[PDB]
């Protein structure tokens, strides 16, 4: 008949977070499952109307329909300030190719409305490429684009256990590309990997290897919009670093240019981690299903492939991917009666100027 879901959390990257939704499995004798979901945190307020048939065809191919609104405040995400009020629709066909893999192709539309953009080099460079000529001295700028996209997704998940795996792998690869007629013209791809290799019969000692990769760029003069950039740093990418701090920093124009510590992301990104999961001290091995200890080496880099270091010779070369950030630490996780609790302590041993260290990082509930 339906379902109401409510979730709450606190994280050092996104502050307090809410998750709420309601669904009807056969809304007014239509056969499709209509739903409404929301999300709020320090920097984003999302909402959407969904309508999904779980068995569109007998083969198992589904047809999902989405209608959304989204508000994003960049300074509340540790980035150079901007505001993106976006809204749109997405249609997606889901193909369960087998019990471990699933694919998904879809079409989309997104209206993006930028505002409150302090004049900075990487952001203005993109605005110039789009035909805008904003003032290099006025804090009050706006920009609107209407894009159409083809979206692709692949999810592989051959893990033994959903929460606290000891063996197997998970891969997620998403892609998207603008369709002609769109204001922007770019592609964007992301790759996420997780591999658990147990080093003992009882699976109490497990080596976990993770990677995250991102690459996006323009097609025909236009650059990828800065609102679609990649980021690294935070408890979910490179522990020990403040959320999104890694990579290029805003070079502001005078209100000669100011170099800064405010992160701006980039169109390229790479993150690798090696984690050794162990039995928890002072706790029994019967609780490894709900408590987990681990030691890790995290590292990542984010770069701007269009940063022209020839004309910005004094400032750092942000098109250089060789500035590999690194950290080492210990993590503790507990599936508590309040949901998943994760506490980590990492000391960044290799950091570039601008990078902000956040040694203690903690997450409880949904994030």
């Amino acid at each position: 008949t339906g379902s109401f879901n409510f979730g709450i959390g606190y994280g050092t990257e996104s502050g307090v977070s809410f998750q709420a939704g309601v669904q009807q499995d056969n809304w007014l004798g239509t056969g499709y499952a209509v739903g409404i979901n929301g999300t709020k945190n320090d920097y984003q307020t999302y909402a959407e109307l969904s309508v999904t048939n779980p068995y569109f065809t007998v083969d198992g191919v589904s047809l999902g329909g989405r209608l959304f609104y989204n508000d994003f405040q960049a300074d509340d995400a540790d980035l150079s300030d901007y505001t993106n009020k976006s809204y749109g629709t997405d249609v997606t066909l889901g193909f369960p190719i087998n019990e471990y893999n699933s694919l998904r192709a879809g079409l989309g539309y997104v209206h993006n409305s930028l505002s409150n953009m302090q004049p900075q080099v990487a952001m203005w460079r993109y605005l110039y490429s789009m035909g805008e000529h904003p003032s290099t001295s006025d804090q009050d700028n706006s920009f609107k684009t209407d894009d159409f996209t083809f979206n692709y997704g692949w999810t592989y998940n051959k893990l033994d256990r959903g929460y606290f795996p000891t063996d197997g792998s998970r891969v997620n690869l998403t892609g998207k590309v603008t369709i002609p007629g769109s204001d922007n013209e770019y592609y964007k791809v992301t790759l996420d990997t997780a591999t658990y290799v147990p080093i003992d019969d009882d699976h109490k000692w497990v080596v976990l290897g993770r990677t995250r990769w991102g690459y996006g760029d323009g097609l025909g003069g236009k650059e990828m919009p800065f609102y679609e950039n990649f980021y690294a740093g935070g408890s979910s990418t490179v522990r020990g670093f403040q959320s999104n701090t890694i990579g290029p920093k805003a070079v502001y124009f005078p209100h000669d240019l100011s170099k800064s510590d405010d992160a701006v992301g980039g169109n390229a990104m790479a993150v690798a981690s090696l984690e050794f999961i162990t039995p928890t001290p002072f706790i029994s091995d019967k609780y490894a299903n709900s408590v987990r200890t681990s030691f890790f080496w995290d590292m990542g880099t984010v770069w701007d492939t269009n940063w022209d270091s020839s004309q910005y010779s004094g400032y750092p070369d942000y098109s250089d991917p060789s500035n590999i950030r690194m950290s080492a630490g210990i993590a503790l996780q507990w599936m508590s009666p309040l949901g998943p609790l994760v506490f980590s302590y990492a000391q960044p041993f290799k950091k570039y100027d601008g990078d902000k260290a956040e040694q203690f990082q903690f997450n409880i509930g949904k994030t």
């Binding site: 008949t1 339906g2 379902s3 109401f4 879901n5 409510f6 979730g7 709450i8 959390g9 998750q19 929460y163 309040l338 949901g339 998943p340 509930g365 949904k366």
Partner: peptide, 10 residues
């Protein structure tokens, strides 16, 4: 992970 306060189906 999701709906840690209430995952209610009816």
């Amino acid at each position: 992970w999701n709906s840690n306060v209430h995952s209610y189906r009816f």
